[PDB]
Amino acid sequence: VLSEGEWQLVLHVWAKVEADVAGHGQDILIRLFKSHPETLEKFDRFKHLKTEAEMKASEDLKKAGVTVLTALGAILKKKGHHEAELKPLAQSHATKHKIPIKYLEFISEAIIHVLHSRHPGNFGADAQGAMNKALELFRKDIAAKYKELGY
Numbered sequence: 640v641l642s643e644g645e646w647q648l649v650l651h652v653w654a655k656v657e658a659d660v661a662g663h664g665q666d667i668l669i670r671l672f673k674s675h676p677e678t679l680e681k682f683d684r685f686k687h688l689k690t691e692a693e694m695k696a697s698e699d700l701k702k703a704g705v706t707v708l709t710a711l712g713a714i715l716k717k718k719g720h721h722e723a724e725l726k727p728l729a730q731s732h733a734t735k736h737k738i739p740i741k742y743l744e745f746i747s748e749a750i751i752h753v754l755h756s757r758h759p760g761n762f763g764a765d766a767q768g769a770m771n772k773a774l775e776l777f778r779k780d781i782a783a784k785y786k787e788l789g790y
């Protein structure tokens with residue numbers, strides 16, 4: 640459970656992302672792919688991309704970044720009341736895309752990495768704490784649906 644002050648922090652951080660959704664989302668996916676190459680293999684849509692330059696130049700990767708962050712942004716703004724929004728993502732990711740929960744931990748770390756990279760001196764220690772908590776809560780709640788389905 641996050642406090643109100645912690646959710647306020649999360650959403651102030653998210654306001655930074657909303658100023659350049661496609662940029663943050665592309666950066667997040669690139670970091671994920673480069674740090675954890677097994678993640679890229681799950682995307683028939685992107686597995687042609689070999690080099691970071693190709694990833695950076697991929698307009699479709701930007702579009703995927705918008706899609707991901709649009710969904711995560713809406714989720715965060717529910718401030719934990721996100722059962723309706725998580726259900727379809729659990730189903731798709733566990734059963735169709737075959738994404739292990741470990742890879743959600745990896746994308747969570749990518750988010751923190753990219754926020755630090757883009758906002759040096761402006762991503763506060765309190766904010767990092769709160770954002771970690773929010774992402775932990777998301778993973779816990781998705782993980783429960785995975786467990787249900789045998790994943």
Ligand code: HEM
Binds near residue numbers: 746
């Ligand atoms: C914050 C975490 C995540 C969010 C909010 C998210 C959100 C989404 C959304 C909204 C879609 C499109 C709708 C759907 O199929 O359900 C999608 C598709 C997909 N996601 Fe995720 N995702 C996340 C993490 C991951 C991770 C970590 C991976 C892989 C390592 C992954 C792999 C995929 C794949 C393969 C697709 C289908 C892409 C396509 O072929 O168009 N997702 N995701």
